[PDB]
Design a protein around this ligand. Structure first.
Ligand SMILES: CSc1ncc(Cl)c(Nc2ccc3c(c2)CC(=O)N3)n1
Ligand SMILES: CSc1ncc(Cl)c(Nc2ccc3c(c2)CC(=O)N3)n1
Ligand SMILES: [Cl-]
Ligand SMILES: [Cl-]
Ligand SMILES: [Cl-]
Ligand SMILES: [Cl-]
Lengths: 4, 123, 123, 4
């Protein structure tokens, strides 16, 4: 999971 | 403020290909010079400008069989159908012309672009 | 010896979401405490272990309406349906418990994992 | 396009  | 799962789109496509390989919920047969290919209308629309136009048509959206132009090569179509479900294109010296012609007809702009580039490098 | 188009899976999912937003070729209604959500069976199956089991069942595969357990929160479902079609999860302090419970029921293992991690950080 |  990432900060888009 | 959303978080994003990097591999989600790839995992979805991998599962859609597993459904295709097991013939689960396929709702259309594409006929190419007597060869038949089963697929999901939504995936075809998501990958091709031609299928997008066909399946948004109020009459054609209900067809279970679509016949492609007789000039379309079944191998070229098969390579492109595999690309739709996997992101992988089996582009070879022996098929590049048939693949490019099929991608132009199917309106798959990124495939047409790479075929044009690979052809230009060989001249 | 294939070449691969990096953005293909993301572009497919983006187009599937555009079809969902315009209600094109949606073939199922998911009912959650009287709230209704239209979707594509194949996308639901590709994202959820629960929908995969439901739509591979020889009787349920033909249903146009699926009713979820009354304990399922419609907002939690809506956030997860958006994630299925976009890879983006709107996880907030106020919805994390409903989102995790819905993801556990839907069998969306990666969503359950991130919810468990975000909850563990707050304790 | 890349070599996968
Ligand atoms: C344009 S809006 C839109 N909405 C939904 C879908 Cl399913 C869709 N598909 C589609 C349309 C055109 C093209 C492709 C897919 C691939 C390509 O090269 N051209 N487009
Ligand atoms: C296992 S083979 C397979 N073949 C096709 C599909 Cl459409 C599918 N979906 C699916 C199954 C289980 C789970 C998910 C999707 C997400 C998750 O967390 N668990 N699986
Ligand atoms: Cl028909
Ligand atoms: Cl393309
Ligand atoms: Cl029904
Ligand atoms: Cl998940």
């Amino acid at each position: 999971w990432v900060i888009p | 403020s959303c978080i994003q799962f990097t591999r989600h789109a790839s995992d979805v496509l991998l599962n859609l290909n597993r459904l295709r390989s097991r013939d689960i919920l396929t709702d259309v047969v594409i006929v190419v010079s007597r060869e038949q290919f089963r697929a999901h209308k939504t995936v075809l629309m998501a990958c091709s400008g031609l299928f997008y136009s066909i399946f948004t048509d109020q009459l054609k959206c209900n067809l279970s069989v679509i016949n492609l132009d007789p000039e379309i090569n079944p191998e070229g179509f098969c390579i492109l159908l595999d690309f739709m479900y996997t992101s992988r294109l089996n582009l070879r010296e022996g098929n590049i012309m048939a693949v490019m012609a099929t991608a132009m007809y199917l309106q798959m702009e990124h495939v047409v672009d790479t075929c044009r580039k690979f052809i230009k490098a060989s001249e």
